[PDB]
Ligand binder design. Sequence first.
Ligand SMILES: CC(=O)N[C@H]1[C@H](O[C@H]2[C@@H](O)[C@@H](CO)O[C@@H](O[C@H]3[C@H](O)[C@@H](O)[C@H](O)O[C@@H]3CO)[C@@H]2O)O[C@H](CO)[C@@H](O)[C@@H]1O[C@@H]1O[C@H](CO)[C@H](O)[C@H](O)[C@H]1O[C@@H]1O[C@@H](C)[C@@H](O)[C@@H](O)[C@@H]1O
Ligand SMILES: CC(=O)N[C@H]1[C@H](O[C@H]2[C@@H](O)[C@@H](CO)O[C@@H](O[C@H]3[C@H](O)[C@@H](O)[C@H](O)O[C@@H]3CO)[C@@H]2O)O[C@H](CO)[C@@H](O)[C@@H]1O[C@@H]1O[C@H](CO)[C@H](O)[C@H](O)[C@H]1O[C@@H]1O[C@@H](C)[C@@H](O)[C@@H](O)[C@@H]1O
Ligand SMILES: CC(=O)N[C@H]1[C@H](O[C@H]2[C@@H](O)[C@@H](CO)O[C@@H](O[C@H]3[C@H](O)[C@@H](O)[C@H](O)O[C@@H]3CO)[C@@H]2O)O[C@H](CO)[C@@H](O)[C@@H]1O[C@@H]1O[C@H](CO)[C@H](O)[C@H](O)[C@H]1O[C@@H]1O[C@@H](C)[C@@H](O)[C@@H](O)[C@@H]1O
Lengths: 309, 307
Amino acid sequence: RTKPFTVPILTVEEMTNSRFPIPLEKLFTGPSSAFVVQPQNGRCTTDGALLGTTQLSPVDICTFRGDVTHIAGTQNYTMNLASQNWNNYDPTEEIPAPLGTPDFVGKIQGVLTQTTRRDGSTRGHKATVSTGSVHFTPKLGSVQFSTDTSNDFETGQNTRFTPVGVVQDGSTTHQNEPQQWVLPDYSGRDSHNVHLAPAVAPTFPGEQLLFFRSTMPGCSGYPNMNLDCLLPQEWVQHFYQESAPAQSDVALLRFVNPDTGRVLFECKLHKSGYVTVAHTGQHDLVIPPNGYFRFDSWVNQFYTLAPMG
Amino acid sequence: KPFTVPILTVEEMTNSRFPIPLEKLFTGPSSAFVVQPQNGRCTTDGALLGTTQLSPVDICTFRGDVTHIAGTQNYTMNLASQNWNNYDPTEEIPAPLGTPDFVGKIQGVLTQTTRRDGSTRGHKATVSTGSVHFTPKLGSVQFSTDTSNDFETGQNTRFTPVGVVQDGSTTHQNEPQQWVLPDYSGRDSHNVHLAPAVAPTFPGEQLLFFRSTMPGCSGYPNMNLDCLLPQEWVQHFYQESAPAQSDVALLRFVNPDTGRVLFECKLHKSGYVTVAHTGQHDLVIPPNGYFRFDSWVNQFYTLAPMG
Ligand SMILES: CC(=O)N[C@H]1[C@H](O[C@H]2[C@@H](O)[C@@H](CO)O[C@@H](O[C@H]3[C@H](O)[C@@H](O)[C@H](O)O[C@@H]3CO)[C@@H]2O)O[C@H](CO)[C@@H](O)[C@@H]1O[C@@H]1O[C@H](CO)[C@H](O)[C@H](O)[C@H]1O[C@@H]1O[C@@H](C)[C@@H](O)[C@@H](O)[C@@H]1O
Ligand SMILES: CC(=O)N[C@H]1[C@H](O[C@H]2[C@@H](O)[C@@H](CO)O[C@@H](O[C@H]3[C@H](O)[C@@H](O)[C@H](O)O[C@@H]3CO)[C@@H]2O)O[C@H](CO)[C@@H](O)[C@@H]1O[C@@H]1O[C@H](CO)[C@H](O)[C@H](O)[C@H]1O[C@@H]1O[C@@H](C)[C@@H](O)[C@@H](O)[C@@H]1O
Ligand SMILES: CC(=O)N[C@H]1[C@H](O[C@H]2[C@@H](O)[C@@H](CO)O[C@@H](O[C@H]3[C@H](O)[C@@H](O)[C@H](O)O[C@@H]3CO)[C@@H]2O)O[C@H](CO)[C@@H](O)[C@@H]1O[C@@H]1O[C@H](CO)[C@H](O)[C@H](O)[C@H]1O[C@@H]1O[C@@H](C)[C@@H](O)[C@@H](O)[C@@H]1O
């Protein structure tokens, strides 16, 4: 027969958020018709086709590389993006934006570091990329950082953004940003995103998406730190390696507790890459820290999940 | 008491999101946008939701008194309710009943009667529902006009909606945005008491939308306007108040000339319809076709595909 499908045998705490480089913490479900679940990172079919902007490196998510150019009389820099290899980025390539680009609207704070090539001297500065900005145009090849210096970065020098966490302005409404479910305009104002991974939704009565959730570090104020992915990064990696052909619509997984030996809940892993459970309402799953998912079988869409207690 | 939908053709009915007639049925996928309109929201047993009300002519209008904002051609309107009484911002509604539920530039005519002598005026006026001054829930909206002089304070003023407008210099059909709720209480405000967002929740299903074409007044506007129930359905359900026997009412869309069934659909108790189709599709329907309620069914009834 065909190569058997599997998911990694890893606990939730053992795995990594696929939308920002931090560990998963906890599983969450809620209704999703009041927002658009259409993230671009962490997108992979069960048989291993990466969609959207999703790539394999769990550390390259939300990072940026290239050379900078100071913007006269401000503390801001434009970065001309390079690819991961440091090869020039191609804006004609059939993707929404550079792989790893952030897929939520918000202000990401991190550190911009630079090596001068002629002598190996080295600098680093606190820097913020605002993905909702008029100047956030990764698909065009340019992005802009606000920083705390006006003189120190040099032109024509390898520069890198390391993301750290998220920010919101305290004088406004608490948790008003980031908005994890609003994609940026990858090409700036008045232009359409292209080649997106499909939006997703539960398509069976009584079902909701299962999200794998982390808390982003916050750098200032009160910023909404929940960040939900559709697949752990290790799943993307796993599926990409294994490339097992989907035998039917849904892969039925059981979440098991090894201590009791008991099945805790069952979920559907849709072929095109997300998870749904049977439940109505918002719910932080309570799980044994060493519980894990295991694959049971390929079933039809119309298979009825036992309610998640 | 048996449930029913009114014996009306689509062309006989009215859009419940702007005061104009229905033209057609449209279906498509809707996971890439939030389907959460606040007008034309009613349960089958006749509970009105969101900002929905009964008058098809009072959708997208405002009433109240005006104030001029010095050195502009703009006026601020303090809203009254439909009855000309004080709008109570505490009331458990997203915004005054009949407020527009999409981000857009609506163009109309602001008109005024001076009570004491019966003199009157009309001026072209536009409301921008994504403006920072669009605060209908707070009791206050703002219009832009063609006079800096004419309107008087303390008098009864009425906005009549006429069409939507869009800025031609920008990319076409970029506005209005029918599926983005306005911020009813302004910037950094949570919408409250909203009618729930809706989605198909059955494999192979898509929402069915009752569509019109709003008139355009300028620019290259997106004139599509989709509503989940026709206003006459909302009115019918309010009257009949028929209790729901299950989760889903099965309607047949029937051609009475031939008596044949064109397609079937699910009318969910909370007030929206789905059909069994994958993809965008303009429906082709005989001009005197109408909807007929056939039975209650459970959530697992499979529809015959709509061709
Ligand atoms: C601020 C800085 O860059 N300091 C580094 C220093 O740079 C000075 C030396 O090159 C100096 C020679 O001793 O030349 C100076 O330039 C002239 C000015 O142009 C002139 O107007 C004025 O009259 O005099 C000065 C010099 O006297 C340079 O500014 O070189 C030092 C040795 O490389 C190096 O140790 C020093 O590195 C900095 O140390 C400061 C403490 O002063 C802080 O630690 C900074 O973190 C650090 O700079 C950082 O590393 C350096 C190498 C570089 O990569 C920076 O981008 C980075 O921020
Ligand atoms: C423009 C207007 O209001 N016209 C109406 C006119 O108003 C003028 C008369 O009150 C006039 C007395 O005959 O007083 C004028 O005020 C002074 C100025 O203040 C002064 O600076 C200048 O030196 O001289 C003028 C007067 O000579 C008023 O402007 O009253 C007329 C009788 O009521 C009335 O027929 C007329 O109504 C307007 O008719 C114009 C034609 O000129 C158009 O049809 C307008 O549609 C119309 O005004 C409209 O109806 C009136 C009653 C009012 O409700 C307006 O708000 C509305 O636009
Ligand atoms: C008045 C008008 O039509 N304005 C619109 C403008 O019209 C010019 C363009 O279509 C242009 C495109 O090449 O062709 C021009 O015609 C030629 C002729 O040779 C001659 O007229 C002139 O000498 O040379 C020009 C150029 O070769 C048209 O006059 O097109 C704009 C671009 O789309 C458009 O934005 C503009 O629309 C108007 O915008 C202004 C903003 O200042 C106002 O909002 C107007 O209300 C708006 O017009 C209204 O909306 C537009 C979209 C349209 O529906 C109109 O019918 C309506 O009045």
